[PDB]
Design a protein around this nucleic acid. Structure first.
Ligand SMILES: Nc1ncnc2c1ncn2[C@@H]1O[C@H](COP(=O)(O)OP(=O)(O)OP(O)(O)=S)[C@@H](O)[C@H]1O
Ligand SMILES: Nc1ncnc2c1ncn2[C@@H]1O[C@H](COP(=O)(O)OP(=O)(O)OP(O)(O)=S)[C@@H](O)[C@H]1O
Ligand SMILES: Nc1ncnc2c1ncn2[C@@H]1O[C@H](COP(=O)(O)OP(=O)(O)OP(O)(O)=S)[C@@H](O)[C@H]1O
Ligand SMILES: Nc1ncnc2c1ncn2[C@@H]1O[C@H](COP(=O)(O)OP(=O)(O)OP(O)(O)=S)[C@@H](O)[C@H]1O
Lengths: 333, 333, 333, 333
DNA sequence: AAAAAAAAAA
DNA sequence: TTTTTTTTTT
């Protein structure tokens, strides 16, 4: 016979028996009160560019969660991922960049100074084998940054064999959702950062909202903790061979979904072709905005008096003087 | 042989023997009349916002029933659950927030008034083990409010070990139905409130109505008693450092299925980031709608006349004026 | 040896000996001819709404048979059962409503006119024991209307003790068939009505008709005699506080299987929240269809000429006029 | 001492001594040859519909054999047995219709022409009591068509008294086989027709053929001689009250196992509610197929020219013209 | 506006 | 002696 009619008793030792019975089967940290749940606090890793994570509040992507990137074509998708790869690899944590569209140039990564010899990579044929590779590489290993590019190009297995022009209703999104339901609970276990980047397809006929959307199904936007999109519009003509020649592209990044900081605070980044995120280009620009450095004429007056008035102002010697860096940024932080 | 031909007699002594014979084998509270079944009446727990539980008719979530939440991406489906947790915790009833998608930040809970040290929690890997943990914690427990988040993420065991991209027809809903068939009878016996929140997936091809649905199968919607879904779209820019800066998210709450009150009566709440339900914001907002407080220009004229016309109007002193609270709500209640 | 080669003789005194032989052992009411079996004729009981049991041909659910209700969520599966309880209870016959999904609010029964103190009830944990309660209460009792709710919730004993996510091949249907095979022969023998209400679960892969079904096995759909199902679609906003506010839900009722009358004849019922079946609200609608009442402008011309043109037209004075009802219905039955 | 090991010698007078030894000990009808056993010819009784027993090859149910009927829900399992009862009752043969599920309404039989005062009947509770009544009424009686309905409801003794939901493995089929081994050799001795009608329960997992079966075990399917199943899917709306109103149910009848005629020859029958098998409806339908009557437009031209083009075409005057029946059936049988 | 193929339990 | 939906694409 079973146990009789029970109300919650008005003294609370009874759930201690439930705690002891839970600990019999499902380990040790299955039920913890939140006060001594020490690893539940947010852990932060930066993004290289200070203006990017002046917007994310904390100071970078929170560990153990899902971040994702999307936006229009040729507008700064892989560059931010490469800079996060280099900044993450600068503390010895191993980073793994799988591919889907085979677009990564090795010398472009060499131009951003990231190590090719300690960069894992895979170019899968189908999307299934590549995402399986990422899944098996995350859980057993202690790698630090897994990054899947171009979820549009993760083709599913059941249409890589069929003829071109067959009906395949609901096959990309089902694979992506059934994949991330498996990968969701494992990633926070190992405190690892994952970024899925994306492309854009339209959606034909809606009377509300913006007519753009991402592919890969609606299961992605639920799980992710921070969503950034980029909208690269114009380029800047520098003093290339003392002439107005295309040498840098202007862009902007704004956060769309966020849950560790207030959202919708945007950011402006400059990108030079073949050179990536100009951190020295944004450092002296943004420090004159809150005026911790001087805003003046040809010389921003300091102890050195070696400042030109151009796109090059102080980068010739702040490479050899990195010691001004710490006292000019963390004040807003 | 057995008893002879039965028709019920035209005097009702015979069923008293059946009442005695039922009482011999199945306890005492097996068969009662409805007149003296005193614990069958509904008990109500509110959820912080006066505007929310003015829309539920009774005055909050009914005890011993099943409530459920859904809604589109990032619309404060988790914050209303957190507020229900805090309002339940403010009376000493121990509340247990398990997880499935690993999204709860501890400092977000500390901002919303709920105590960290008296909140049970669990972040299981398998959904099956976590739901078993919740069910076993309910029955012997004296707990008051259990809550599972994100039933999309309660993955079953039969696909947590299989390869990615395998056919698993009818596996989520079977786990959910076979779970709630077990947990249906135990919950009303201990007068305990449980809420299941959810996400949204599409549905390919329906000629009538809405193309939206919830995952986790149809079996959840039957067992529930109150179903609220929220749809947050826009935001409000206040006077953040005297500038239109993103400080509050606007949303609305409507009920769909309800069986302890009139249904479909909706509600409007604004939410500030890092602050949750602006209860002092909705308080004077709804109070001038029935004119229990005055509506005028820069001063909504009362006996003290300390009223601005902004986002901050009178919350600076009604936070320390508790006596306005009980006399501006019970008139409609 | 035994009796020799016997063909049936061409004179019929021989079966009278067999009648005396069956009369020797198995009582008196074993073999009777159909010409004098006076209790084999159908007895009826009305069901509150006139338009409901106009559609059933006879005039209500027949006694001694099995009635089953199903349908999608929140569509008056429970309220039509409550109205049958009230209509059966109005003539002194004691009714017994068991509970399985713990949804019967007492004040909802209070507003629908059924007496609280003369309603038997049970909320069993294992559905096996609940069917045991109903079976033991039927046969010895003189109870008039038993009704089992929510046969999805009648859980079997063999999985109320096991873990969640255990394989339990074909356990609901075997218990339902094993209860109903015992309960079938006893129900007609005491001329008593049973009502089994249900839910809806889908079914994977059928290329014909409807993909929907009921749970609880195919045993139930055989034994039942009259099968109603409801599909509530829309609601009506009356002149509540002279405003379009939700006060009535619209629904329809069609029979599917019937064996006392022609089938497939449907009906249309309004349901007001907190009011149930407005019999006055369907009374004037069905009476104007065959025009025993007048169809005119704001005034329909009778001996009073006090009729409005709204949702409320004449229910103010037919509440005090009991003589109108018996002469406006008998012409179609 | 016994006789030696012998071969049957090459002249056959010795077996006549064994014939005399057999007939001395077991009567006269013990051993008879092929020729002078005149009652081993098949005797045929029709079954109301000409289109039904035009598909059984012979012309109806063969006497002294076992016929079984099964099919899905509400598909005229009951009405074909009723029509066989009526057609067998039309020649003074006494019919015995015992029940198991208490479904027979007497007025439904009153509409179908079967006489009520000469129809024996019983509604037992035990299955062994019902089969005992059938057995004790067959062997002494001169009864002509015994019929047990719905062998799914012939509950055995050992679970009509025990608790509900107990292990009762192999109890239905054991009672059925132990009935049929006793009843088989007695039925053919008195040339009586017995028909069992049945129900359908599924079978858990077979990847070939049909997943459906009958209950009652595999003992019945051996002993049967003609096996029919009915599958009623659609209905037909005639010109009832000059409107497309539900008045006709459509179905088909096919045979599965047969051993007096070639099998698998199907049939098509319309059924009207409250009217049964429209033999006058099928009559002109089958006659136009071999075109012994005229197939034309609004008038099929014969000597009277009183034929419409509707559902009602010739039934108004073929009721008064009984001489048209014999010229349609004798050409094909 | 038109679209498909999937299984493991007694 | 059945139990159970999963998901957009342009
Ligand atoms: C050059 O090189 C840059 C490549 O970096 P990203 O834009 O991050 O990559 P990408 O252009 O998005 O690659 P796509 O989107 O597949 S064309 C372009 O944006 C141009 O500025
Ligand atoms: C804040 O408050 C809300 C908290 O999340 P919820 O509304 O409960 O659901 P959400 O928008 O989907 O984010 P989730 O639930 O963590 S995916 C978000 O709008 C955050 O930006
Ligand atoms: C009212 O009246 C109805 C009562 O419920 P029912 O129609 O019997 O079935 P329901 O809509 O599924 O709700 P249930 O069955 O109690 S969960 C609902 O529409 C309530 O809103
Ligand atoms: C008529 O004639 C038929 C009589 O029932 P049958 O075809 O013999 O079997 P049925 O449809 O399962 O109903 P049952 O067997 O009595 S529950 C039904 O279709 C009624 O509507």
């Amino acid at each position: 016979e079973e146990i009789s009619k029970k109300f919650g008793a008005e003294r609370e030792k009874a759930l201690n028996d439930a705690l002891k019975l839970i600990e019999k089967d499902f380990g040790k940290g299955s039920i913890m009160r939140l006060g001594e749940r020490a690893e539940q606090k947010v852990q932060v890793m930066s993004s290289g560019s200070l203006a990017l994570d002046i917007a994310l509040g904390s100071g970078g992507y929170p560990k153990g969660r899902i971040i994702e990137i999307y936006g229009p074509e040729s507008s700064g998708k892989t560059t931010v991922a490469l800079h996060a790869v280099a900044q993450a690899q600068k503390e010895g944590g191993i980073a793994a960049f799988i591919d889907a569209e085979h677009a990564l140039d090795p010398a472009y990564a060499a131009a951003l100074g990231v190590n090719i010899d300690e960069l894992l990579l895979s170019q899968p044929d189908s999307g299934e084998q590549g995402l399986e590779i990422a899944g098996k590489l995350i859980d057993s290993g202690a790698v630090d940054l897994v990054v899947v590019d171009s979820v549009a190009a993760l083709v599913p297995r059941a249409e890589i064999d069929g003829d071109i022009g067959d009906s395949h209703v609901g096959l990309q999104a089902r694979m992506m959702s059934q994949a991330m339901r498996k990968l969701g609970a494992s990633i926070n276990k190992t405190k690892t950062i994952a970024i899925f980047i994306n492309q854009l397809r339209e959606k034909v006929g809606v009377m509300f909202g913006n007519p753009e959307t991402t592919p890969g199904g609606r299961a992605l936007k639920f799980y992710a903790s921070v969503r950034l999109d980029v909208r690269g519009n114009t380029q800047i003509k520098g003093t290339g061979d003392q002439k107005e020649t295309n040498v840098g592209k202007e862009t902007k990044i704004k956060v769309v979904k966020n849950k560790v900081a207030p959202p919708f605070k945007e950011a402006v980044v400059e990108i030079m072709y073949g050179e990536g995120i100009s951190k020295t280009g944004e450092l002296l620009k943004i420090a004159s905005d809150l005026d911790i450095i001087k805003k003046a004429g040809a010389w921003y007056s300091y102890k050195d008096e070696k400042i030109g008035q151009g796109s090059e102002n102080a980068k010739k010697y702040l490479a050899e003087h990195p010691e001004i860096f710490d006292e000019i940024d963390k004040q807003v932080r």
